[PDB]
Symmetry: D2
Subunit: 424 residues, 4 copies
Amino acid sequence: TAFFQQQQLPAAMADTFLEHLCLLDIDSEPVAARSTSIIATIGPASRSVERLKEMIKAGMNIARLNFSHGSHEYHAESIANVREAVESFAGSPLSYRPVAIALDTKGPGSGPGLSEQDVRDLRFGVEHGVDIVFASFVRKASDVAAVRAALGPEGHGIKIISKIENHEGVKRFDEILEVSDGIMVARGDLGIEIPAEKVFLAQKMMIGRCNLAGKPVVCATQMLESMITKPRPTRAETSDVANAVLDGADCIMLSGETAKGNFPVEAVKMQHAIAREAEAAVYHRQLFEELRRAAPLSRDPTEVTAIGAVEAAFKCCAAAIIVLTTTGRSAQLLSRYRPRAAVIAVTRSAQAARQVHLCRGVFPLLYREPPEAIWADDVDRRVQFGIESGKLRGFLRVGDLVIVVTGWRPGSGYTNIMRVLSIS
Amino acid sequence: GTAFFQQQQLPAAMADTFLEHLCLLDIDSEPVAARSTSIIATIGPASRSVERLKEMIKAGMNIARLNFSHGSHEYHAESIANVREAVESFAGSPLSYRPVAIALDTKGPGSGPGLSEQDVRDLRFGVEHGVDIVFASFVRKASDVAAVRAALGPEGHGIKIISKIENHEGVKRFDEILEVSDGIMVARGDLGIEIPAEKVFLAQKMMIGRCNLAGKPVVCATQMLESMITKPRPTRAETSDVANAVLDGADCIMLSGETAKGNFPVEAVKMQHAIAREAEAAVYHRQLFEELRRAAPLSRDPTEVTAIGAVEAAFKCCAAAIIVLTTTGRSAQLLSRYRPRAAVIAVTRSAQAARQVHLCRGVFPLLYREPPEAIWADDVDRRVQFGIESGKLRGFLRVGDLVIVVTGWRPGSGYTNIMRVLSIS
Amino acid sequence: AFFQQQQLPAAMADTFLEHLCLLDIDSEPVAARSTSIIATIGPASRSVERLKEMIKAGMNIARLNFSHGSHEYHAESIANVREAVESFAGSPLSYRPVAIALDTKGPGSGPGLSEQDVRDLRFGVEHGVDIVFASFVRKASDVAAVRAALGPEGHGIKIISKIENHEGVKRFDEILEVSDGIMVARGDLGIEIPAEKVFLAQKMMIGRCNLAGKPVVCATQMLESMITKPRPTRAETSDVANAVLDGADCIMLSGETAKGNFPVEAVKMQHAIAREAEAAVYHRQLFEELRRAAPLSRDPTEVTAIGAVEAAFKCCAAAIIVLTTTGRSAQLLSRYRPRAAVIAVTRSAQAARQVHLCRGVFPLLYREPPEAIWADDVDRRVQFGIESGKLRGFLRVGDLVIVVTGWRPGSGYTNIMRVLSIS
Amino acid sequence: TQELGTAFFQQQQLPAAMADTFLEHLCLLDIDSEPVAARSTSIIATIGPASRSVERLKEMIKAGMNIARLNFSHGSHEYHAESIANVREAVESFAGSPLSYRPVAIALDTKGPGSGPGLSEQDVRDLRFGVEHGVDIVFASFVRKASDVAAVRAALGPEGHGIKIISKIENHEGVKRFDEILEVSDGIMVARGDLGIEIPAEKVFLAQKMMIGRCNLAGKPVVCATQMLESMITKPRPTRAETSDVANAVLDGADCIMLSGETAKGNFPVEAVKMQHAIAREAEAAVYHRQLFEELRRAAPLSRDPTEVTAIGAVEAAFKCCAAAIIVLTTTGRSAQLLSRYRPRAAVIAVTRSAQAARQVHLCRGVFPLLYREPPEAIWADDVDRRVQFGIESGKLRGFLRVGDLVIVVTGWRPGSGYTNIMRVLSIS
Ligand SMILES: O=S(=O)(c1ccc(O)c(O)c1)N1CCN(S(=O)(=O)c2ccc(N3CCC3)c3nonc23)CC1
Ligand SMILES: O=S(=O)(c1ccc(O)c(O)c1)N1CCN(S(=O)(=O)c2ccc(N3CCC3)c3nonc23)CC1
Ligand SMILES: O=P(O)(O)OC[C@H]1O[C@](O)(COP(=O)(O)O)[C@@H](O)[C@@H]1O
Ligand SMILES: O=P(O)(O)OC[C@H]1O[C@](O)(COP(=O)(O)O)[C@@H](O)[C@@H]1O
Ligand SMILES: O=P(O)(O)OC[C@H]1O[C@](O)(COP(=O)(O)O)[C@@H](O)[C@@H]1O
Ligand SMILES: O=P(O)(O)OC[C@H]1O[C@](O)(COP(=O)(O)O)[C@@H](O)[C@@H]1O
Ligand SMILES: O=C([O-])C(=O)[O-]
Ligand SMILES: O=C([O-])C(=O)[O-]
Ligand SMILES: O=C([O-])C(=O)[O-]
Ligand SMILES: O=C([O-])C(=O)[O-]
Ligand SMILES: [K+]
Ligand SMILES: [K+]
Ligand SMILES: [Mg+2]
Ligand SMILES: [Mg+2]
Ligand SMILES: [Mg+2]
Ligand SMILES: [Mg+2]
């Protein structure tokens, strides 16, 4: 078939990484959906409702609100505009794309503990329902603990992504990652605190440790910087985006390219285009083998089902792995093994649907329908919802094979079943 | 969690290199898993007593070979009846019943091309008596397997044909023979006479490797515990040979003379069982599994896709077993190809499939006798519980263990597609 | 203490994932920078005093873009480069050779060699350029045309084919076979093929070049923001580091040094990043794969090359000193990407300049006249390498070095490898 | 290459050796791929009534005996001295043509401590006998700890400091205290007979494979010892299990294989030697060198010793060109031993003036000793070149080398042992 010369499949079947590089083809068109999420910073150039709709079409998955600048009234208005542009597509539930809201804090700024503004800003996040928090200048575990105690009673569900932007944060990394929900390689400040020529070492090390831990990792600053004023990026910029994906980053960020630049939609489209190409060029054979050898033995059925499903997906070239999820944990565990198959996550939790964008290859679907009396009937309708959406979005075709990860009883934490299905 | 697990060579199995694996092999690391390599015992004067056969089934005989090179049709029918009587004496407790296959080893073409007249009569005898396997002697080409298949007729279409490679031509035309055969037997006796004796190990290791790749059973035959015909204990070379046949990747090991005419037939079965358990625990699963997958091509067959997914899931949690419901034994055979450390408990209603799956390494067959339940999903769950209960009774499973359960979406063979992680209660 | 620096904990990891996890920002690179820097000479860099501070920063090859400028302008640039290079020839133990590369304008609309290109190639032969960056090579017949235009005298000039269009990428294997090396001309490539596909072309071409043992250059917009700003972007420092990690022998500045406000700063920056990236190379997998892909050879030079590289890894050799006439012996050692330096002691001034195209090869130009006793002349050249290495900080007393030599004079007779202790 | 001929790449299991996986390697094993290289695993033959005849010993040396074992459990000192004299007489009968002379080591296998701790009185007398008679190796029976090896070393005295001590592991304690024994011993013998009595018979293969692996890592010789071709005591042909056992001992990584009873008292002693030689050649060609070498390197620690550094460099160079042999000049045999540790397919040819080193290097797999008799040249470099040419001439005469082949020459920068540091690529003229 033509199939075995599309998503860099000749290069993916190579026996060595050197042979894999030699088999990379510019004419091998990526077919799979773009898995690395795009975080776009919302500013003057992008807070228009009609502009936000354009950005969602372009591939924006997470909207970032930089709390360094702007008032609470400004940020609440930006949030409302994002939600209005997101809900304008809720008329066709088979094509609706959830979009997460992330609050990027100001920072401690030469002081002990959480700054007074950060305490006020985190309460604002709780009161406005932010899905993610990018905690600025995390240096130790206590910093993470402070950002989490700040999310008061009503906000323990918000995902804290610790921003590493100084030498101390890099040295105390393992202790930070243990208590954080993910990490952001905040390259701008990092490139000021540590020598500029050492930042790539910090990026590659942190991405690798995050991949091992199964926790999301974000590449953040100056990725397409020249696109603030120019319609096209530099050769170094497209290389940087592609290399962040190849390193193993779950998310790529635009901050200024979308916040204040002349080409915000073009920067999103560009990051989408590069990410698709870079994801097809990932050497899955070594990546999966190493992921397995490093990942410890688990007696958790969710984790055991995850490798079994990822292995099964590789064996048959599964178009997608469709997993039902309440908290997103099942989808996150599948994501850790970096399958070439899309992780279609079907969920009834609008928050979980937005928060799974932090995990690479997870494509969230929000199930809006009324429940069936028979739980088994309800599970099959949600599985069919993922198939119907996948078909519509081009992820699946009739005749394809899919892996369907489900649980034996309702409620989260009981995933234990994996099925091989033929799309009808 | 589950403290003090220095047993079943787990430190050696977790090594990063094969050299490190060898260095971590421990004589004090006792094997805990059930013996996976089947034992073929040739039935003769020293072993056709019904009470002796009962002793050999307890010792671990899985397949009864009948050497049609000696004995009359009357003698072999009586041997078969004695075997079946000793096998069925344990059918009163179905949770502990062990199926035993009956294989017919032909005399051979001797000095003449094609099937000999006696072989055609002997193959008809096998069909009439209901043998499960046929060890076709002196297979040299694919047309020889076709001749044996034709002699079995229409009724003998379910009988498994294991081609015996015992000459130079059979070794050179191996790939064409394996394609049309159900499995291979490395008939080392005649092979050691046709080709130089110092070259037989190359033929054995090559054929076992190609069989492992193909997913078809391979038998290591002849003189494995030869000194046990007259002595109660084998030589150092003999125990090494049995252990090395298992390490090579052989699905089955054989006794022919040690059990047929010797003074210690039950002791030879017990010895082969003891060595096989030790050798199976010393298999370097890390490289074996990785190489098996890199060589196995991509598959759009749900049975084959579910097989790796289940084997990978079993390795991840150190699953005590992989319980699979099978009609023809194919689902269990596909799991077996990936050589999991977990036991492939294969529950089946087919008494022939139950006997024939002994040719596949690591497949512990169970014969489910109960008639079908009205609700299909309830019948499946009862068969799964039958595997758990048999598994518990036989010491394979304990409460708290994790098992992988391979099932299908509808009745009939060929629809295996589901894998589940269960906790033993 | 030794085991902590030059990313040695990360280099000893058993997996690439474990290698990434062991990368340390406090593990300072100790080795000399192996990836050569090609700096484009323009208005911002043709001053003799500026060229001297560009050689100190780490410029190894001076590029002359024949798209702009007259023959008189380029001859003056050449003279200024040679004047700045020869100003350091007073101390031969510290003298750094600098290659001169001519970048052709290109065929443009023309199917074969353009008239200007034939004139420019003759100019290069007459002026003694070491390298030629042939623009827009699409097939093997294009390389042949450039080779013919160089004539009989230009047979020693290295031809680096620039791949800058779709056809050049598809016909890559036939071009690499007839070329001395390849340049991933990212600028035009990013215009001919989609910008999001250029990294695939770069990584593929670098990989195939590493396998072939032929030099490969990463060329456009590496530190672009340094034309107007004193510091590069996070994407730019990442791009340079990733070009080195991909396996590129040379990194280029074209505009950052040619017309930008910070030409010396761009050279210093590329040097700083390359040292960090070279120490973070996963040598265990790189060497193992290089060996498994490299075919068996009955050539004693090639056989001695792996033997020496393997021996250098075994003892953590500070450097490998090789005596070369044409640079081929040093090039073959370079193919195996050793962590140890490749000190190439040559009497050929052209070979000394041209070996900058090979990663990890540090050229020393021996000038002294030949000794009466052949074995004594060899030992004096070996001692010349040791003395330059000690002076430049590559070697210390107590270190172990691998010494690659031959059994007789003349090129092509390399067959000996020795383990020496620095005294 | 390709221009060495198809017949070259379809022999010595070269298609199977070039496979990318061990499974692919097994699938490419060919019975018609004839071994061409010389047999590298040494054969230790036990000398008894069936083999102490001078003419019989000559037949066994031709068949492939490398080390003669003297079992001190049976026989008197007078009997063993006579056996030694007959061995030396049969060995020296071939010394007329030094380019084809094969050195043969003499090994003393002690009786053992039996039912008592420490060295038995007879063992002290027997060890003194060995020193007085000039034995090259001692197989110390029932070694259980490092202090046992020290006792045997002390009993050999000052003169017996050059005698190699191979500790026999034949009980549970010896297996558990293996690492401390191997550290103080020159090598190990997997004494399977007693081991199969002390530990369960079904566990002996685990002990064998573990000890061989640890010895390969340490670079110290390892011997597989009991019942290898047992049926050949009475029968002219061995069983399928026996030929498999010998082949598997070689594939495990054993430097030496032993005959004890098959050669000592059996009806077919020369036939058992010929059989062990035939199997070893086939098994050596079927060794998967790619994984073996890669793993050996990853486990071997970094070394600042030039002899060790030159050893990998030479072994790697030999694999790259399919070098016919690796000629090394050695005084103590250490240089050849270090090359042997990396298990090259290229036959290591060791040129030495020490007759004891020539005999003792049989303990190292792949080492083919040549005893150089010529007196020293005035010019040191000329003496080295003459010894290198002696290796080439013996190599050509014995069929190891042909004109056109590539060889690797490992030499040193000065006389005296411990100065190996040079590796050269030579073309055979
Ligand atoms: O040893 S290499 O440096 C190399 C080897 C030979 C060459 O010729 C060469 O040019 C480079 N190396 C590159 C990356 N791959 S990879 O398969 O793409 C990969 C595997 C594993 C990774 N983990 C697991 C989670 C991060 C990777 N993260 O980024 N990439 C990863 C492995 C081999
Ligand atoms: O390279 S070896 O010959 C070797 C030999 C001696 C050493 O001291 C050493 O360090 C390496 N070595 C043999 C054993 N395997 S193995 O792990 O046991 C294995 C893996 C894979 C196999 N497939 C996949 C299906 C058959 C094997 N089939 O039989 N065994 C198999 C590893 C490779
Ligand atoms: O019917 P529900 O409550 O949505 O659950 C369907 C199945 O998916 C799961 O909820 C997965 O949830 P989580 O990923 O959040 O752990 C299983 O526990 C459950 O059996
Ligand atoms: O035995 P039933 O009741 O027909 O149930 C079908 C079950 O067995 C299977 O038939 C497996 O059979 P095969 O392995 O012989 O193909 C599956 O479809 C399912 O697990
Ligand atoms: O690298 P090249 O061009 O093959 O030259 C290698 C040569 O180097 C030498 O060491 C130098 O010898 P000369 O300086 O006399 O040419 C020769 O022995 C060997 O042939
Ligand atoms: O293997 P050994 O005993 O350490 O020595 C290797 C020998 O090789 C040599 O080249 C030959 O020297 P000799 O003439 O003293 O034997 C020396 O470097 C060294 O004595
Ligand atoms: O916030 C950021 O992205 C930073 O500091 O680089
Ligand atoms: O059955 C046979 O002939 C054998 O095993 O050699
Ligand atoms: O010519 C070049 O180098 C380019 O276009 O990048
Ligand atoms: O002496 C021996 O060989 C033994 O005991 O095994
Ligand atoms: K901020
Ligand atoms: K140009
Ligand atoms: Mg910041
Ligand atoms: Mg037969
Ligand atoms: Mg151009
Ligand atoms: Mg003993």
